[PDB]
UniProtKB/Swiss-Prot annotation:
Entire protein: shown range: 203 to 481 of 2126
Classification lineage: Eukaryota, Metazoa, Chordata, Craniata, Vertebrata
Effect after changing K57M: No effect on kinase activity
Effect of L169F: Decreased inhibition by Cl(-) ions
Residues recorded with modification Phosphoserine: S176, A180
Signal sequence annotation: none
Similarity-based family: Belongs to the protein kinase superfamily. Ser/Thr protein kinase family. WNK subfamily.
Protein name: Serine/threonine-protein kinase WNK1
Species this protein is from: Rattus norvegicus (Rat)
Function as written in the Swiss-Prot or TrEMBL entry: Serine/threonine-protein kinase component of the WNK1-SPAK/OSR1 kinase cascade, which acts as a key regulator of blood pressure and regulatory volume increase by promoting ion influx. WNK1 mediates regulatory volume increase in response to hyperosmotic stress by acting as a molecular crowding sensor, which senses cell shrinkage and mediates formation of a membraneless compartment by undergoing liquid-liquid phase separation.
Residues the record marks as active site: D166 (proton acceptor)
Annotated positions binding ATP: S29, T99, E100, L101, M102, K149
Result of changing D166A: Loss of kinase activity
Phenotype for S176D: Increased kinase activity
Subunit composition and interactions: Interacts with WNK3. Interacts with WNK4; inhibiting the activity of WNK4. Interacts with SGK1; promoting its activation. Associates with the mTORC2 complex. Interacts with UVRAG. Interacts (via amphipathic alpha-helix region) with EMC2; promoting the ER membrane protein complex assembly.
């Protein structure tokens, strides 16, 4: 039986396999994450509650389909996905995901704490992300992340590896939607503003992640809103921070990755083959 010495169980999956605990693990955007338990296995999981929002019919179906496909997936540099379903308690409805639990939190958090990365760490972590992306891209059908950022790359441990999270949630990003000016303005790949993407959207995102890691700032901080950024991205204007990359080989890789024309970008295969990533 579950002892509730400090923490009460406050929710369950339909079959009661998964339990939610009233310990919040983290908050970001349109989700809160709780400590959970897989009672089959006695293994702690993340109980992620996505903000109550009305989804369109298409969004609901895209998501349930993509979720299914995540279910079996196991790779060192991917955060495992277990299940998801609609949930309510009192007056609040939400989507729950149960996933592997990453208690060391995000790359973003780390980069906020440690503003100078060692080349060795940048090399090894960027490589892991690429292995992750390559695993996704080679599923059947291929899984494209579509919203990769430091905010959804997770560290296993201060000296551990990284794992890509946020799998499948891009389906609920309203990339083509008008949106409120709040928080730091975001960019995306040129073609992604109109959702005409393929695997190369992840390459662009990867390059921007690498840039952020190398410079320790979010690209395009010189812009006040996402409209300004849009105009730059879709006109080939790089973020100021590009010019602050100290190390020639890193700058080259980033440059290969963040090209305006998606067809001109490095492939993942290229990148894993590159001297920089070949020790
Ligand atoms: C969401 O915000 C946080 C803030 C802080 C965290 O740790 C301090 C988090 N740890 C997690 O395991 C998680 C959940 C990780 N799981 C995933 O990202 C994931 C993986 C596959 C499919 C879907 C997903 I919301 C979130 C988290």
């Amino acid at each position: 039986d579950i002892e509730e010495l400090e923490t009460k169980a406050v929710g369950m999956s339909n079959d009661g396999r998964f339990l939610k605990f009233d310990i919040e693990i983290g908050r970001g955007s349109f989700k809160t994450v709780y400590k959970g338990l897989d009672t089959e296995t006695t293994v702690e999981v993340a109980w992620c509650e996505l903000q109550d929002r009305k989804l369109t019919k298409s969004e609901r179906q895209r998501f349930k389909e993509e979720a299914e496909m995540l279910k079996g997936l196991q790779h060192p540099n991917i955060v495992r996905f277990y299940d998801s379903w609609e949930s309510t308690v009192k007056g609040k409805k939400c989507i729950v995901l149960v996933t592997e639990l990453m208690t060391s939190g995000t790359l973003k958090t780390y980069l906020k704490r440690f503003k100078v990365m060692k080349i060795k760490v940048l090399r090894s972590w960027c490589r892991q992300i690429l292995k992750g992306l390559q695993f996704l891209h080679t599923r059947t059908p291929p899984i494209i992340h579509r919203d990769l950022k430091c905010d959804n790359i997770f560290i296993t441990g201060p000296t551990g590896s990284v794992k890509i999270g946020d799998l499948g949630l891009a389906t609920l990003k309203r990339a083509s939607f008008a949106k409120a000016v709040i928080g730091t303005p975001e960019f995306m790949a040129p073609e992604m503003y109109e959702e005409k993407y393929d695997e190369s959207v992840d390459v662009y995102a990867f390059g921007m992640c690498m840039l952020e890691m190398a410079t320790s700032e979010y690209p395009y901080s010189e812009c006040q809103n996402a409209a300004q950024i849009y105009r730059r991205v879709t006109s080939g204007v790089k973020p100021a921070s590009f010019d602050k990359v100290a190390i020639p080989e890193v700058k080259e890789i980033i440059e290969g990755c963040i090209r305006q024309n998606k067809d001109e970008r490095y492939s993942i295969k290229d990148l894993l083959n590159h001297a920089f990533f070949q020790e």
